[PDB]
Amino acid sequence: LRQQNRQIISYVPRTEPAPPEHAIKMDSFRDVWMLRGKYVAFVLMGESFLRSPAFTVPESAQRWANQIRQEGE
Amino acid sequence: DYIDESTGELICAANMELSLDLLAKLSQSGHKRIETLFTNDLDHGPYISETLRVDPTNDRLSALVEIYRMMRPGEPPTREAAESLFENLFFSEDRYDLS
Amino acid sequence: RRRKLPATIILRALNYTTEQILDLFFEKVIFEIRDNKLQMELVPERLRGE
Amino acid sequence: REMGTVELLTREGEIDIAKRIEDGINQVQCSVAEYPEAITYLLEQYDRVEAEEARLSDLITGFVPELAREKFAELRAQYVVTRDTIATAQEEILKLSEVFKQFRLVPKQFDYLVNSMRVMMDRVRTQERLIMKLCVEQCKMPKKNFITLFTGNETSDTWFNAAIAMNKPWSEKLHDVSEEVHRALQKLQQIEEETGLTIEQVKDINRRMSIGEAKARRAKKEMVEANLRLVISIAKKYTNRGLQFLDLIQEGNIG
Incomplete structure (x- = not known):
């Protein structure tokens, strides 16, 4: 029989992520934010925030958000 | 968080x-x-946030391991040894005097 | 006078978490979510020198 | 770091290592007592002691002095009847070895027996390597055939005429080194006559005692690696007496 030795403690780096860029601009469209692809897909009604299905073309998302905001009080 | x-x-x-x-x-x-x-x-100035981002340690244990490695390079760290070293560094009356 | 380490290492070794460190070393501003959801409190002395 | 890579023992491990050491020592003792040259050297040393050329102190380290003298006389009688009983020789050699093991000799005497055994086995193996070099590395005769016709005989012309007269184009060209083959055979015969025994049993004893020595060395190394910590702890207290800590711990390791 033997006796157990003291354990050796180690650790790992935190590997901090990279911040996003979020290069955006509001000229006249009000729905022309630039994130990726569709680039905008934003809508906010009521006390909570809801996520759009991210229509790739800007006009479709724009008028869908408009017609949603008109019917959504 | x-x-x-x-x-x-x-x-x-x-x-x-x-x-x-x-x-x-x-x-x-x-x-x-x-x-x-x-x-x-x-x-x-947000220097604390930048220092935290640079800092690669995770918890108290990681900080103690890093301090022990800096103080005694080439020696395998131990929890008890690192805790004793940290306690004795500035929080021991036998080794620290602030008369 | 040994190799320099980040100053947060000793603070973490003092049994202090990231949230407690941020609380101690920074001020807190609360952002609400009412209609508009963009209605933060505004302390008057926070609009000086910027 | 190197010292802490290993872990200290316990009482049960110490008992197990001591038992292993005792078993290896007993095996080595049996292997070295099974030879008659040990008894021959014992009798020669006893005769030199009786001839006012030495002392009784370095003859036997106690017992396991008229009793010692009568035991030596009995050992001499057993050896002479063993040499006079050349199918009973093996049994009487075993009895002589048991009686020898019943005697507590001197470590220097045991080391002399061990190195004489090493000398004789080295001579035998040198002759064997000469034998294999004279035809395997010179006549270029086949490996498996060599093994088959050489395993066991090692004395006759089984490896001499077969390697030459086997109708291969490279076989009949070394009757010049046939003379060296005969000389090696004569040397082996002289060594065998001097020893009074065979060769395979000698090799068996040699590798058995080698295994025992290796086991004892492994156990001693384990004990030393376990007690390095105690050595350091003892050497801690003399660090300021004109000697270096490394020197002190090395001396402690030797102790």
């Missing part, structure tokens, strides 16, 4: 940049109160 109530996932960790996608994600999970840090560019 804010965690989800359904799956218990970490929606956003402490001391990270907040963006549109992040706020949308943490607001679709049912959060109503959000607090940030008030930092200026000439009066309240």
Whole structure:
């Protein structure tokens, strides 16, 4: 029989992520934010925030958000 | 840091940049109160946040391991040895005097 | 006078978490979510020198 | 770091290592007592002691002095009847070895027996390597055939005429080194006559005692590696007496 030795403690780096860029601009469209692809897909009604299905073309998302905001009080 | 109530996932960790996608994600999970840090560019410099970002340690144990490695390079760290070294460094009356 | 380490290492070794460190070394501003959801409190002395 | 890579023992491990050491020592003692040259050297040393050329102190380290003299006389009688009983020789050699093991000799005497055994086995193996070099590395005769016709005989012309007269184009060209083959055979015969025994049993004893020595060395190394910590702890207290800590711990390791 033997006796157990003291354990050796180690650790790992935190590997901090990279911040996003979020290069955006509001000229006249009000729905022309630039994130990726569709680039905008934003809508906010009521006390909570809801996520759009991210229509790739800007006009479709724009008028869908408009017609949603008109019917959504 | 804010965690989800359904799956218990970490929606956003402490001391990270907040963006549109992040706020949308943490607001679709049912959060109503959000607090940030008030930092200026000439009066309240955010050097603590930058130091935390640079810092690769995770917890007390990682900090103790790093301190032990810095103090005694080439020696395998031990929990008890590192704790004793930290206690004796500045919190021991036999080795520290502030008359 | 040994090799320099980040100043947060000793603070973490003092049994202090990231949230407590941020609380101690920074001020807190609360952002609400009412209609508009963009209605943060405004302390008057926070609009000086910027 | 190197010292802490290993872990200290317990009482049960110490008992097990001591038992292993005792078993290896007993095996080595049996292997070295099974030879008659040990008895021959014992009798020669006893005769030199009786001839006013030495002392009784370095003859036997106690017992396991008229009793010692009568035991030596009995050992001499057993050896002479063993040499006079050349199918009973093996049994009488075993009895002589048991009686020898019943005697507590001197470590220097045991080392002399061990190195004489090493000398004789080295001579035998040198002759064997000469034998294999004279035809395997010179006549270029086959490996498996060599093994088959050489395993066991090692004395006759089984490896001499077969390697030459086997109708291969490279076989009949070394009657010049046939003379060296005969000389090696004569040397082996002289060594065998001097020893009074065979060769395979000698090799068996040699590798058995080698295994025992290796086991004892492994156990001693384990004990030393376990007690390095105690050595350091004892050497801690003399660090300021004109000697270096490394020197002190090395001396402690030797102790």
